[PDB]
Design a binder for this molecule. Structure first.
Ligand SMILES: CN(CCO)c1ccc2cc(/C=C(\C#N)c3ccc(C#N)cc3)sc2c1
Length: 159
C-alpha cells in the first residue's frame, strides 16, 4: 500500500501513547492526593485506578493491532536492504516494549487485587512504593515508544 497509510498508522499510535501518558499522570495524581491526606476514600481511588487500567489495556490492544498492520505494510513495500534492517530493528524493539507494558499492567492489576483484600499504614506504604516504581517504569516505556515512533517517521521521511 501507500506511504500515506504508513503515516496514518504511526500518527494513530502516537495519539494512543499520548492518551496513555495522560491517564497515567491522572492516576499518579489521585494516588499522591490520597497518600498526602479514610476507608471509602481508598475504595474511591482504587475504583478510578481500575478504570484507568481498563482504558490503558484497551489502548494497548489497539496499538498492538496497528503495529501488526505497520509490520505488514513495511513488508509489502520494496525498501532497500539498509532501510529495511533499520525499520525492522525498531519494530522488534517496539514489540518488546509493548510486551513489557502488558506484563507491567498484569503486575499492577495483581497488586490492586491484593490491596483490596486488606484493611494499616505500613501495608499502604509498601503498596505505594511498588506502585511508584511501576508507574515510573511505565513512563520510561511510553517515552521510549514515543522516541522510536518518531525515529520511524524520520527514517521513512514522513516527518
Ligand atoms: C502501577 N499502577 C498503579 C496500579 O494500582 C499502574 C496503573 C495503570 C497503568 C497503566 C499502564 C499502561 C501502560 C504501561 N506501562 C501502557 C499502555 C498502552 C501502551 C501503548 N500503546 C503502552 C503502555 S502501566 C500502569 C500502572
Amino acid at each position: 500500500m501507500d506511504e500515506e497509510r504508513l503515516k496514518e498508522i504511526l500518527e494513530e499510535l502516537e495519539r494512543i501513547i499520548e492518551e496513555v501518558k495522560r491517564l497515567l499522570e491522572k492516576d499518579e495524581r489521585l494516588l499522591r492526593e490520597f497518600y498526602r491526606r479514610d476507608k471509602e476514600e481508598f475504595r474511591r481511588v482504587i475504583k478510578l485506578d481500575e478504570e484507568v487500567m481498563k482504558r490503558s489495556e484497551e489502548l494497548l490492544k489497539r496499538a498492538e493491532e496497528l503495529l501488526r498492520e505497520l509490520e505488514e505494510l513495511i513488508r509489502r513495500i520494496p525498501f532497500s536492504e539498509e532501510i529495511r534492517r533499520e525499520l525492522e530493528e525498531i519494530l522488534r524493539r517496539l514489540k518488546e516494549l509493548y510486551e513489557e507494558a502488558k506484563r507491567l499492567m498484569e503486575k499492577a492489576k495483581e497488586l490492586t487485587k491484593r490491596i483490596k483484600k486488606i484493611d494499616d499504614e505500613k501495608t499502604l506504604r509498601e503498596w505505594y512504593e511498588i506502585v511508584r516504581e511501576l508507574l515510573e517504569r511505565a513512563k520510561e516505556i511510553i517515552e521510549e515508544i514515543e522516541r522510536l515512533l518518531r525515529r520511524l517517521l524520520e527514517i521513512l521521511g514522513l516527518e
